[PDB]
Amino acid sequence: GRYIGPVCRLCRREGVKLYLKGERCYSPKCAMERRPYPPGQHGQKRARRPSDYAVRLREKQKLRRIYGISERQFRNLFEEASKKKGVTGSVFLGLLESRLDNVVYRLGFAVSRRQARQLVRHGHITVNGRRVDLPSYRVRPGDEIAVAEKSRNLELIRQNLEAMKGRKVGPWLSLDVEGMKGKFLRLPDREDLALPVNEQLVIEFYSR
Amino acid sequence: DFEEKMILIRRTARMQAGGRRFRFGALVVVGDRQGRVGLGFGKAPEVPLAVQKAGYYARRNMVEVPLQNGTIPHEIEVEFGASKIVLKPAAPGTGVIAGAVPRAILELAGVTDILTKELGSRNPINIAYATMEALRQLRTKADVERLRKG
Amino acid sequence: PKKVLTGVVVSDKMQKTVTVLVERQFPHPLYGKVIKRSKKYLAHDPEEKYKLGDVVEIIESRPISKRKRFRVLRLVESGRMDLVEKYLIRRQNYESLSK
Amino acid sequence: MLTDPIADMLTRIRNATRVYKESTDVPASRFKEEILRILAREGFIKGYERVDVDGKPYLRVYLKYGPRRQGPDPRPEQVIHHIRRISKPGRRVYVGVKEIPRVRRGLGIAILSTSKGVLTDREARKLGVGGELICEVW
Amino acid sequence: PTINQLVRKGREKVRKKSKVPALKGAPFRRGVCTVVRTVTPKKPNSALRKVAKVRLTSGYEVTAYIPGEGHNLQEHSVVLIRGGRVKDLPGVRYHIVRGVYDAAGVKDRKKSRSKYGTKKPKEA
RNA sequence: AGCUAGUUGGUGGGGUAAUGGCCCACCAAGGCGACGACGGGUAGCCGGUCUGAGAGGAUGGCCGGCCACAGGGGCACUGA
RNA sequence: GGAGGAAGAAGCCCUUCGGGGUGUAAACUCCUGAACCCGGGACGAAACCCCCGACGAGGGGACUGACGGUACCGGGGUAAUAGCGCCGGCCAACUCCGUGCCAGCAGCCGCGGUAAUACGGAGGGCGCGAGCGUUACCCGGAUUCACUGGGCGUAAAGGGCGUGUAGGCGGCCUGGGGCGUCCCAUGUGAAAGACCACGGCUCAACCGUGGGGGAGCGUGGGAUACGCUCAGGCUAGACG
RNA sequence: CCUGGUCCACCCGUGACGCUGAGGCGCGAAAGCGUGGGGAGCAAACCGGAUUAGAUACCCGGGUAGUCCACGCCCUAAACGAUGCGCGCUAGGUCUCUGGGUCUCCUGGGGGCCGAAGCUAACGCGUUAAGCGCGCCGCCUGGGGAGUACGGCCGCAAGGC
RNA sequence: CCGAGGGUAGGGCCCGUGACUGGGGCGAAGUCGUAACAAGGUAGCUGUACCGGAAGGUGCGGCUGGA
RNA sequence: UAAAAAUGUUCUGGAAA
């Protein structure tokens, strides 16, 4: 179930800095900022020209690890992302952004991704009226994500909701900071998502 | 300048009184991901040396590819030796559906969407060359017409 | 609609009955090639007026006997012992494919 | 005794085009001329013309090539690159109008024999008819 | 061959032959070792492989291999045949499944224990 | 690799809701087979299911349609 | 479980004895609240039937819930399971020790004979996760029975050679027929499934509604290039 | 003496009568078999001599089937161009057999070599195709087991299919 | 009359089994030789026939995949 | 195209690179 374990252990390995912890992973010590190398006993020696396979693996893991989505879903959602008319490149990336908890994280609310999930698994999060608790819930157009009321007074929801004053949300989401709402104006775009991932490879890895 | 990407390096041997003496083979493909690729096979007593050499010939055995939206004008089945290769145009998003050797070329040529299939002997060198003839032989509605004018 | 077939008359030593050899051609289900093939029908001849080498039409009919489920619709051409010989010859060869 | 007049014709063209011959002779047949008319209109040959070799009706096809080239082997490019008989007597091939093949993504052509005349893939498709698929040429 | 020759003779399906007649394909098959010895392997290699010769519920008496180091099989131990051949043993075409019936798991095994009976040790 | 005596056809019967050698006398000698008859083996068929770029290949469990059977076997009674 | 949390505790493992790794992982700090508790608690069930109207139409009335005191909702609410395979190449993942053609591994090639990324253990890593491997069987890859889409001088593959039966195949011009073939129309092609659109269970899996395919085969109509058939004409194949 | 194929020339006659060919039928080197005949030379088997560790072999001296004829069987082969039959098409150079020519040389049929284009894994093939095409037939699907067994047909047998 | 089944008798197909026996495949370090690969020391291969512990030898004819 | 010339045997199992 959703990994759970040494994550700023993958900020490493994938060698492409990751902030799955948020605050710290954002500090002068993303773990990455002290060891730009993979873990293990070796981790700092010549590296064989990674095979054509390896690259794709790493590209995929880069992405999948970047959400916490466990393979099964990851790869599953991928297939849906295939039949759907269009470029799998956009689509998929888009269908990865439609992930409730994700958006949660995408719209402040939670410092990081792994945290945004729990907010969902406890009710704290709410949609177009009625609340929801499935991290897999897929957001659709014109739907706002609101915090619950019992929470609004919680020490956490505060500080986290504060970091919004000043900072602007992604070009496909709004935000009633005082009224914790913000809608999902439209599926995000390749460019809007500045992710250290080369989707086109992650795609090739599922061909074989 | 271009991308450069080797398809395969290999070590061969010839015999002598004192046993076997070796030599290396670098099959390098180079391009700009926007119309120009070239293949070159270099041979030398040291790998390094061979791959640099295969790079040199590489730029000399070039070929204009008529890219069209990331794909190839039509489909061609070129045979070389006992190595056959088939290129069939694809729609945007498809990507490159080929093996390591032909992909390396098609990708450095700037091809983005393409259906491929190796038939017959899959020898790397031979397929690799059969791929260049293949790309070399493509035409566009444009040059087909300047052929049957009147 | 009652199936109507056209064939030649091979044999008629039966009383009021005539065996007809209906040919047909069609595309091979896998290899394309058009191929002939044939079947023999035991059409009824109450009038006893059709004989050997007679290209006649044959129509589906209420069972007249075991096997006989067709009547002779109408003569289409007379004299074709040629078509009959082929048949006859083919049946003849068989007598050499034995052991 | 020649078992496939057309097949032969396609072949005689292929054979000389490949040795940069100026023109090639082929025994005359009304049906064959049709093919040729199409081969000329779509531009593959320079043209044909009923003529007479040693007192017998022949068809003289005039080949067309590309311009001379550089490097080794300056032999010009070929206008008739491919030309393969599809339907042969050993196995005929009929195609429904929906079934009509698309030759070389459009840069090529198939030649059908329909109840409306020997027309090309485009002509056959537009006319909504289908037929025996004589050959394909690209 | 000519199309006509295909129409006449036609092609021929392959038909695969099983490397394991454990009847009904049966993922497995039960039996009893009537002989439990050690054969000497094929060539390059030398050793003393432990193999049992088992009488089956398929009505066959085959010889199978006892994987892992150290086993507990005797002339009458019921056993579960798995099917998986051994490259050096000319005769053995099946593997005895460790951890089923009289077949004991591999005492003290700690890696790939799932492939050798051997339960799971309590970190105690 | 040849098979066939109710065997193939006829006429008049019995029979049936009804065609028919389905069954019966009598008559005629027929019928079928390398386009694979007869025989031996295996098997319930299909919609579909899995796989495949496709053509194909494999399959027919759940659900739906048809068939067949009811310990093995023969028969009829009631009755639409 | 989440967010914090050390130029980085211990233990275990490596080491060119400086140190490196497991690792923000833990501990530790706050924070949420799977379970469980208390209260509330369904839809699926509206007609048969009854009354007004004629036991018709239409309107109104009453009984009925196995699943269940379940789903679901409100309030309260505890940090609360992790395993399996693999790490020589194919193939993602490497070191130390043990052993010494032994014990064992092995899908293919092959690993072990005293320095073994291949055996066995450990550390470390990779993969996947309430799962993870193994065996059996089907398709793929296998254009490796090749219709699409292969071959036969030397790799498997030309019959010892003739004559010829069935069969297959067939030159040039014209006309009639229209079986092949092609075109329009039309009947048929159940349902479910599949695909697409949209909906209903918090999502999904399931599920509903709608939409679109469909060759085949029947019927009627039409075309005539090519194949076929009848007919007439030819001489370039063939024979004399 | 009887008889087959076949090629050139004249273009005179027929008017597609054509190609191919599962089966069938015929032929089919040598050895081998059955009658009888024949038998010089040769020569399996067999007997010596020599060689050799041995020598059922190589070498030497002998020698019977057989080899030869007739009639009838046998039906195999590296029966080979290891390359099925037919037709069209695609540079030339050279030597050669046989025919016709307005006998510089041309033109037809055949036998060789080298080589256009093209083909091939390569070697090579290349108007005598292994090139480019159409028609029909035979045959191949990893090595061994094995051209073995069982069955059937054939044969006197040996064995063949 | 027909008729399930039972009974006597004799055929056909297939499966299991049998003293003994034929060859076959496989199996780290057995015995004899030396046929083949370099005129492999007698050019090799080949159909057949006779012969020999064994490879094989010789006869007849054929092949070049030998000079 | 024609094609002469040698009496005389043998080397355990793995692994080399």
UniProtKB/Swiss-Prot annotation, chain A:
Cofactor: Zn(2+); [4Fe-4S] cluster
Binding site for Zn(2+): C8, C11, C25, C30
SUPFAM superfamilies, per the entry: Alpha-L RNA-binding motif
Keywords: Metal-binding, Ribonucleoprotein, Ribosomal protein, RNA-binding, rRNA-binding, Zinc
Gene Ontology annotations for the cellular component aspect, listed alphabetically: small ribosomal subunit
Entry superkingdom: Bacteria
Cited InterPro entries: Ribosomal_uS4 (IPR022801), Ribosomal_uS4_bac-type (IPR005709), Ribosomal_uS4_CS (IPR018079), Ribosomal_uS4_N (IPR001912), S4_RNA-bd (IPR002942), S4_RNA-bd_sf (IPR036986)
Domain S4 RNA-binding: residue ranges: 98-160
UniProt record, GO biological process: ribosomal small subunit biogenesis; translation
Pfam families: Ribosomal_S4, S4
Hydrolase in keyword set: no
TM ranges: none
Cofactor binding summary note: Binds 1 zinc ion per subunit. In a number of structures (e.g. 4Y4O, 5FDV) a 4Fe-4S cluster is seen in place of the zinc cofactor.
GO molecular function: metal ion binding; rRNA binding; structural constituent of ribosome
UniProt KW Metal-binding keyword: yes
Subunit structure: Part of the 30S ribosomal subunit. Contacts protein S5. The interaction surface between S4 and S5 is involved in control of translational fidelity.
Role according to the record: One of the primary rRNA binding proteins, it binds directly to 16S rRNA where it helps nucleate assembly of the body and platform of the 30S subunit. Binds mRNA in the 70S ribosome, positioning it for translation.
PANTHER family registered for this protein in UniProt: 30S 40S RIBOSOMAL PROTEIN (PTHR11831), SMALL RIBOSOMAL SUBUNIT PROTEIN US4M (PTHR11831:SF4)
Family under the similarity heading: Belongs to the universal ribosomal protein uS4 family.
Protein name: Small ribosomal subunit protein uS4
Organism of this sequence: Thermus thermophilus (strain ATCC 27634 / DSM 579 / HB8)
UniProtKB/Swiss-Prot annotation, chain B:
One Pfam family recorded for the sequence: Ribosomal_S5_C
Signal sequence, renumbered to the chain: none
GO biological process: translation
Keywords: Ribonucleoprotein, Ribosomal protein, RNA-binding, rRNA-binding
UniProt cross-references to NCBIfam families, sorted A to Z: rpsE_bact
Reported function: With S4 and S12 plays an important role in translational accuracy.
Miscellaneous comment text of the record: Is positioned such that it could physically interact with spectinomycin.
Free-text domain note: The N-terminal domain interacts with the head of the 30S subunit; the C-terminal domain interacts with the body and contacts protein S4. The interaction surface between S4 and S5 is involved in control of translational fidelity.
Subunit field text: Part of the 30S ribosomal subunit. Contacts proteins S4 and S8.
Descriptive protein name: Small ribosomal subunit protein uS5
From Swiss-Prot, chain D:
Record Pfam families: Ribosomal_S8
Gene Ontology cellular-component annotations: ribonucleoprotein complex; ribosome
GO biological process: translation
SUPFAM superfamilies cross-referenced by the UniProt entry: Ribosomal protein S8
Quaternary organization: Part of the 30S ribosomal subunit. Contacts proteins S2, S5 and S12.
Role of this protein: One of the primary rRNA binding proteins, it binds directly to 16S rRNA where it helps nucleate assembly of the platform of the 30S subunit central domain. The combined cluster of proteins S8, S12 and S17 appears to hold together the shoulder and platform of the 30S subunit.
Entry's family note: Belongs to the universal ribosomal protein uS8 family.
Protein's name according to its UniProt entry: Small ribosomal subunit protein uS8
Organism: Thermus thermophilus (strain ATCC 27634 / DSM 579 / HB8)
From Swiss-Prot, chain E:
Coiled coil: none
Chain positions with 3-methylthioaspartic acid modification: D88
Residue span of region Disordered: 105-124
Basic residues bias locations: 108-119
NCBIfam families documented for this protein: rpsL_bact
Name of the featured protein: Small ribosomal subunit protein uS12
PTM remark: The methythiolated Asp-88 contacts a modifed residue of the 16S rRNA close to the decoding center, and might be important for decoding center assembly.
Source species: Thermus thermophilus (strain ATCC 27634 / DSM 579 / HB8)
GO cellular component, one term: small ribosomal subunit
Superkingdom of origin: Bacteria
Sorted UniProt keywords: Methylation, Ribonucleoprotein, Ribosomal protein, RNA-binding, rRNA-binding, tRNA-binding
InterPro entries: NA-bd_OB-fold (IPR012340), Ribosomal_uS12 (IPR006032), Ribosomal_uS12_bac (IPR005679)
GO biological process: translation
Protein family according to the UniProt entry: Belongs to the universal ribosomal protein uS12 family.
Complex formation: Part of the 30S ribosomal subunit. Contacts proteins S8 and S17. Interacts with IF1 in the 30S initiation complex.
Disulfide bonds: none
